[PDB]
Amino acid sequence: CTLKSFTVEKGIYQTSNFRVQPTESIVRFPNITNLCPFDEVFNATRFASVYAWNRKRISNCVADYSVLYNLAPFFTFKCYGVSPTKLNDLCFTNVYADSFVIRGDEVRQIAPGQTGNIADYNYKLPDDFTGCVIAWNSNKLDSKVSGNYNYLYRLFRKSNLKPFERDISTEIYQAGNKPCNGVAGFNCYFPLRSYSFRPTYGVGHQPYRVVVLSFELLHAPATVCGPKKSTNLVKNKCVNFNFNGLKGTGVLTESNKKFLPFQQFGRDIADTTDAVRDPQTLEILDITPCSFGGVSVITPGTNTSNQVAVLYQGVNCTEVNVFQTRAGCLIGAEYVNNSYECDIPIGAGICASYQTSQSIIAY
Amino acid sequence: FVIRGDEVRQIAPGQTGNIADYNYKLPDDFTGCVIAWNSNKLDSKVSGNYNYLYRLFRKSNLKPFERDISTEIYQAGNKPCNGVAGFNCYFPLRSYSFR
Amino acid sequence: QCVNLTTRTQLPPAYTNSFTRGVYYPDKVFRSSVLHSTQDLFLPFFSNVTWFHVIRFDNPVLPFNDGVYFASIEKSNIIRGWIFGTTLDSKTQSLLIVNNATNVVIKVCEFQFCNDPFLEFRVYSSANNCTFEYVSQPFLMQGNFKNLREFVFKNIDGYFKIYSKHTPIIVREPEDLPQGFSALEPLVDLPIGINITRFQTLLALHRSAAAYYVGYLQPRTFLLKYNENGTITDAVDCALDPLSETK
Amino acid sequence: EVQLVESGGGLVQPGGSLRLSCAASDFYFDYYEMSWVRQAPGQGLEWVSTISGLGGATYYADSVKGRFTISRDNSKNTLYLQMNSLRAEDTALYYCATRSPFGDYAFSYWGQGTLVTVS
Numbered sequence: 001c002t003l004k005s006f007t008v009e010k011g012i013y014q015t016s017n018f019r020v021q022p023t024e025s026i027v028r029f030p031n032i033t034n035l036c037p038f039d040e041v042f043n044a045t046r047f048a049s050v051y052a053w054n055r056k057r058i059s060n061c062v063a064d065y066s067v068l069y070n071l072a073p074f075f076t077f078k079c080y081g082v083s084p085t086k087l088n089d090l091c092f093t094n095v096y097a098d099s100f101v102i103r104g105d106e107v108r109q110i111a112p113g114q115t116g117n118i119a120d121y122n123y124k125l126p127d128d129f130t131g132c133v134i135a136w137n138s139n140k141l142d143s144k145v146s147g148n149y150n151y152l153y154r155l156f157r158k159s160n161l162k163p164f165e166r167d168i169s170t171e172i173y174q175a176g177n178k179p180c181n182g183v184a185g186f187n188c189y190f191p192l193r194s195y196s197f198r199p200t201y202g203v204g205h206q207p208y209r210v211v212v213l214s215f216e217l218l219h220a221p222a223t224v225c226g227p228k229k230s231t232n233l234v235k236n237k238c239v240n241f242n243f244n245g246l247k248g249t250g251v252l253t254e255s256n257k258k259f260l261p262f263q264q265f266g267r268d269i270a271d272t273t274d275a276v277r278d279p280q281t282l283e284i285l286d287i288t289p290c291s292f293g294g295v296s297v298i299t300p301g302t303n304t305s306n307q308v309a310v311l312y313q314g315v316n317c318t319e320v321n322v323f324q325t326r327a328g329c330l331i332g333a334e335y336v337n338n339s340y341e342c343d344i345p346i347g348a349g350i351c352a353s354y355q356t357s358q359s360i361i362a363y
Numbered sequence: 364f365v366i367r368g369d370e371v372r373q374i375a376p377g378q379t380g381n382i383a384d385y386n387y388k389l390p391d392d393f394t395g396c397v398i399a400w401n402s403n404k405l406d407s408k409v410s411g412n413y414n415y416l417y418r419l420f421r422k423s424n425l426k427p428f429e430r431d432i433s434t435e436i437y438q439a440g441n442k443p444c445n446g447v448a449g450f451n452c453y454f455p456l457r458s459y460s461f462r
Numbered sequence: 463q464c465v466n467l468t469t470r471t472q473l474p475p476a477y478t479n480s481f482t483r484g485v486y487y488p489d490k491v492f493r494s495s496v497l498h499s500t501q502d503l504f505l506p507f508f509s510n511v512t513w514f515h516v517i518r519f520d521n522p523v524l525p526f527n528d529g530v531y532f533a534s535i536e537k538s539n540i541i542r543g544w545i546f547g548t549t550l551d552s553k554t555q556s557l558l559i560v561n562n563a564t565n566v567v568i569k570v571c572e573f574q575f576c577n578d579p580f581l582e583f584r585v586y587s588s589a590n591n592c593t594f595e596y597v598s599q600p601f602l603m604q605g606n607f608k609n610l611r612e613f614v615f616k617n618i619d620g621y622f623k624i625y626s627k628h629t630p631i632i633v634r635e636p637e638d639l640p641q642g643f644s645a646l647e648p649l650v651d652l653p654i655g656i657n658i659t660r661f662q663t664l665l666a667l668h669r670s671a672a673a674y675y676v677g678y679l680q681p682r683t684f685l686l687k688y689n690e691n692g693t694i695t696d697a698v699d700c701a702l703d704p705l706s707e708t709k
Numbered sequence: 710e711v712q713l714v715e716s717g718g719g720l721v722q723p724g725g726s727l728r729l730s731c732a733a734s735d736f737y738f739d740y741y742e743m744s745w746v747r748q749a750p751g752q753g754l755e756w757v758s759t760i761s762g763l764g765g766a767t768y769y770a771d772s773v774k775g776r777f778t779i780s781r782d783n784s785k786n787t788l789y790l791q792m793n794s795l796r797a798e799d800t801a802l803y804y805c806a807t808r809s810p811f812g813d814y815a816f817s818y819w820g821q822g823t824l825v826t827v828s
């Protein structure tokens with residue numbers, strides 16, 4: 001094919017180039033440090049009330065949804081829009097976390113579509129909500145046997161208002177057309193309901209810290225991403241390395257090149273990447289491509305036979321009978337201890353021939 | 364076919380938008396000629412012209428040389444409308460307005 | 463609130479040559495036994511650097527064209543920071559580096575800096591809207607010894623690069639830039655890019671013997687030899703002498 | 710469906726000012742989000758600025774960071790647009806589009822839009 005002829009004469013011909021292909025896809029991205037303050041929404045003070053539910057502009061950070069785990073036995077991981085998992089491969093331009101404590105007897109009310117009395121007069125969730133809703137009991141740290149009135153909510157309301165807005169206006173209420181106008185008596189009470197959390201109460205109406213995470217996405221660039229790959233480091237093999245800005249293929253090993261605290265990469269005479277530094281774990285490696293060379297086919301001639309010998313220039317018979325010479329690794333010939341005239345020159349004083357069955361020899 | 368005046372640029376290889384992604388997409392190796400001409404005297408009347416439809420919502424971008432004549436309802440949210448054409452169930456084919 | 467000190471006149475400065483000093487690392491690449499040719503902003507060898515001496519309050523505003531080589535032969539840490547700005551009118555952003563008791567604080571703001579700033583920071587009174595703040599705890603710092611502090615301030619493609627070098631020097635005959643190689647290492651690469659045209663220093667007067675050699679950088683091609691351990695040992699100016707250009 | 714209008718100016722000198730007002734009604738605006746999307750004559754669409762209804766945080770484009778500011782009036786259910794330092798290459802017909810954050814990247818409703826040219 002390389003000679004463009006069906007009759008190959010006697011001699012050595014280099015056809016193509018042999019090169020080992022990589023196996024893995026190691027990335028080794030640095031240890032993120034700009035984490036998002038998710039501890040001031042969950043591990044903050046007791047909680048915020050449901051009539052003044054607050055939320056901060058959680059944007060321009062790297063929010064790892066794995067730090068939310070390793071806590072109290074939070075059950076009811078009911079999230080809509082996206083699966084409970086696979087959040088680490090998406091980036092929303094903004095996240096809003098709501099913190100409010102209501103009764104746990106009918107926590108099913110906090111969901112897209114479901115309505116009632118708690119999720120109507122206090123905080124309603126629209127039918128379209130791709131966030132994540134979670135809940136957990138906190139009676140062990142948010143209760144006391146005197147009567148717990150540190151959390152209030154609403155009972156008196158006329159109709160259902162718009163969604164996603166705080167309700168802090170507590171003006172006088174009217175159940176009908178009675179012109180009360182500031183009496184503060186019967187049928188004209190003050191619109192403010194209170195709670196009573198006691199450890200003696202059952203699991204039904206005990207306090208439950210609930211948190212919803214609304215993932216808002218706009219035409220602005222994505223800011224709140226998740227963690228990156230950060231794959232394991234496997235050396236002593238040709239790998240596709242995918243470092244911060246130095247991508248390529250090559251083998252990695254332990255290097256004795258003592259780098260400097262500010263230096264991160266390393267070049268050579270050919271202006272090629274020779275050594276690198278693993279960002280998360282300070283360790284100097286040495287990027288070296290795997291074995292490669294040229295394949296040469298020794299043929300005694302198509303007129304007399306069809307057997308061939310393969311010589312890989314620049315190998316060590318450890319990456320492809322075989323014979324290791326100073327020019328590579330000859331495969332297809334038998335090293336005879338005799339010495340004849342050089343018929344097919346191979347190199348380093350070694351030549352080949354087709355002598356007597358019939359087989360290719362190297363001497 | 365018939366498009367808008369400002370939407371004549373999207374009928375070109377590589378150009379994207381609303382008509383070149385949901386109605387008619389030209390390949391990058393398009394070896395042809397696009398010829399456009401105004402029809403304000405033959406396709407417009409002063410009554411309210413709504414006899415030209417176009418698709419606005421689609422799941423994915425339309426591949427080059429593909430005709431989509433289906434009438435499957437779209438879902439802008441996560442609610443299973445199951446064919447009701449209401450809130451978050453916008454109709455995929457809306458009409459033009461030529462005055 | 464600032465206050466203009468009394469009994470302060472002007473003093474004509476002097477000039478002295480730089481004995482092959484002011485060579486930093488161009489990039490963050492490790493190399494060994496390599497003779498690399500760089501075309502970055504360096505300090506030309508044997509350049510007339512100023513000799514601002516204080517023993518007495520020398521703090522003039524100096525232009526910042528393309529780079530500043532700031533040397534300090536001190537023993538008691540007389541200077542404690544710098545100020546960079548294009549107009550010094552409390553209108554645009556300006557950079558300030560001030561040395562604390564245990565840290566270095568860098569601000570990008572338009573504080574009410576007065577004509578004669580001097581050092582608890584009584585140089586300004588108020589603080590406008592700032593864009594960048596950086597507190598670096600490791601700051602920047604036996605009788606017959608002295609401290610030599612080298613600094614290279616550059617402002618190209620926005621990033622204000624700050625190189626530093628600390629060394630002990632023996633008290634010799636009247637002070638000047640000693641002979642030898644320094645190889646200043648990259649220290650600060652602030653996310654900045656506000657325009658900077660002029661600069662000044664910051665003294666520290668503790669009311670109950672220093673000198674700086676501000677120089678100017680310019681485009682020049684240098685030949686740097688990297689040693690086997692990854693540091694630069696010598697440098698060729700390539701534009702100093704026929705021998706320097708034939709080597 | 711339900712759709713409303715937007716008014717304002719139609720021509721402004723290169724250096725003046727203009728106040729565009731997109732007037733909406735009978736819509737769930739406070740939990741939705743609004744945005745302006747321009748269209749250069751002969752070119753495609755370009756996102757100018759956007760405001761949310763949840764927290765009210767605004768996001769502008771990199772070319773109009775210090776020249777365009779908007780504010781949504783929830784009492785009147787209208788969206789304002791006060792343009793400052795109008796150059797000569799910013800002429801475009803601004804569209805008033807609102808969408809829901811808990812959905813896809815497709816605009817729900819499109820306004821009428823009006824072309825404003827600068828000398």
Ligand SMILES: *[C@@H]1O[C@H](CO)[C@@H](O)[C@H](O)[C@H]1NC(C)=O
Pocket residue numbers: 038039040041042043067068069070071
């Ligand atoms: C809260 O504290 C727990 C226990 O220290 C910790 O595991 C968790 O990551 C913290 N963060 C949150 C979710 O607030």
Ligand SMILES: *[C@@H]1O[C@H](CO)[C@@H](O)[C@H](O)[C@H]1NC(C)=O
Pocket residue numbers: 031279280281
């Ligand atoms: C990266 O994080 C890992 C896990 O905590 C830690 O062991 C490693 O030392 C960190 N590396 C640095 C120095 O950033």
Ligand SMILES: *[C@@H]1O[C@H](CO)[C@@H](O)[C@H](O)[C@H]1NC(C)=O
Pocket residue numbers: 315316318
């Ligand atoms: C080939 O491998 C053997 C065993 O590791 C080693 O002794 C020899 O020096 C190697 N030769 C070459 C050419 O690298």
Ligand SMILES: *[C@@H]1O[C@H](CO)[C@@H](O)[C@H](O)[C@H]1NC(C)=O
Pocket residue numbers: 477478479508509510
């Ligand atoms: C530096 O300037 C002074 C005054 O102009 C001059 O006397 C001296 O020779 C100059 N030295 C150099 C290195 O040019």
Ligand SMILES: *[C@@H]1O[C@H](CO)[C@@H](O)[C@H](O)[C@H]1NC(C)=O
Pocket residue numbers: 560561562563565567582583597
């Ligand atoms: C000195 O250090 C303290 C502690 O970090 C800091 O509060 C103060 O701002 C610093 N002073 C200066 C010089 O800004």
Ligand SMILES: *[C@@H]1O[C@H](CO)[C@@H](O)[C@H](O)[C@H]1NC(C)=O
Pocket residue numbers: 552553554590591592593
């Ligand atoms: C900071 O204040 C100055 C003076 O009012 C102003 O010119 C500049 O734009 C302000 N920058 C910020 C961060 O808003």
Ligand SMILES: *[C@@H]1O[C@H](CO)[C@@H](O)[C@H](O)[C@H]1NC(C)=O
Pocket residue numbers: 689690691693
């Ligand atoms: C480099 O380090 C080696 C080992 O410590 C040492 O023998 C050699 O002299 C050093 N070279 C210099 C002076 O950088």
